Amino acid sequence: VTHEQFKAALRMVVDQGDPRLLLDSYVKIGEGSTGIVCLAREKHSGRQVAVKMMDLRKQQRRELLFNEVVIMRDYQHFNVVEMYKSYLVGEELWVLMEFLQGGALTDIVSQVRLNEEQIATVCEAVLQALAYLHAQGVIHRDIKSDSILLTLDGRVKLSDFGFCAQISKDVPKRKSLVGTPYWMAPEVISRSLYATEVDIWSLGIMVIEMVDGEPPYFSDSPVQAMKRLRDSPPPKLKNSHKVSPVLRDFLERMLVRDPQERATAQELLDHPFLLQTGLPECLVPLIQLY
Ligand SMILES: [Cl-]
């Protein structure tokens, strides 16, 4: 797919309009090998946005940018980092995103072992996002601690939709090997037909991150880890002694090989473990420390 064909594809799906007339008060806050990020203000609402300005001539895996724009433009949820607009601006794609300042969950969970109230607070938020996305037929496919972003006031939001997919009556299952090795569901690794259940497995691995500090098999090569995950009974907590019977049960609903037996996001929202959910404030001191 040439640069010219990709622009043509994007032209069909992006918002109309030219953000060079619509935004102001730009401040460069980031840069990468394929673009920059600027904070800016939307003129009539005053809203602050983070504008990813992607040089499509340098960008690779351009199909992922297309898929995220096409899929996520029409979904919104309080626990999902919102994509307000996307625009084709000459040779670049500008994507206007909700701006958050509390870092990523990994910043904290790499350093500290969350208590069960904190774990419940995080899981309840991610599960509200997933229950909404799954009901829409969206599969995230890259759930892991660093896909979870936080606000300074302790709100928990899901981000990093690069690998997302949309299922439909017509195409009800995916079979692509996508995601991040240590968090991939066994059926993804085996390239079986799969649907929204894979995000629940990944969430289970994230719970292990929260309790233990790292996912299973983390010292193995990513290829070796995938082989063990593909073949083996589900991985267990290293710190199993730490965890309440109710949290053990919650985790055991997630890390289930048989995707039909595995819990759905809605089942997990209804689980007694989430009776332990705290106020956003329960994360705020940690977010400030890390
Ligand atoms: Cl924030």
Residue numbers in the entry: 385 to 674
Please give sentences taken from the publication describing this entry.
PAKs are serine/threonine protein kinases that are regulated by Rho GTPases of the Cdc42 and Rac families (Knaus et al., 1995; Manser et al., 1994; Martin et al., 1995). In humans, the PAK family comprises six members, which are classified into groups I (PAK1, -2, and -3) and II (PAK4, -5, and -6) based on their domain architecture and regulatory properties (Bokoch, 2003; Jaffer and Chernoff, 2002; Kumar et al., 2006; Zhao and Manser, 2005). Group II PAKs (PAK4–6) regulate a wide variety of cellular functions, and PAK deregulation has been linked to tumor development. Comparison of five high-resolution crystal structures comprising the kinase domains of all three monophosphorylated, enzymatically active group II PAK family members revealed a number of catalytically productive and nonproductive conformers presumably representing snapshots of catalytic domain movements during catalysis.
Finally, we solved the structure of noncatalytically productive apo structures of PAK4, PAK5, and PAK6. The activation loop residues important for autoactivation (Ser474 in PAK4, Ser602 in PAK5, and Ser560 in PAK6) were completely phosphorylated in all structures determined, and the presence of a stoichiometric phosphate moiety was confirmed by ESI-MS (data not shown). Studies on cellular stress-response pathways suggested that PAK5 and PAK6 are linked to this signaling cascade by an activating phosphorylation on the consensus MAP kinase kinase 6 (MKK6) site (Thr-Pro-Tyr) in the activation loop (Kaur et al., 2005; Maroni et al., 2000). The structures of group II PAKs showed that this consensus motif is embedded in a deep cleft and is not accessible. In addition, PAK6 has been reported to be responsible for regulation of androgen receptor signaling in prostate cancer (Schrantz et al., 2004; Wang et al., 2005).
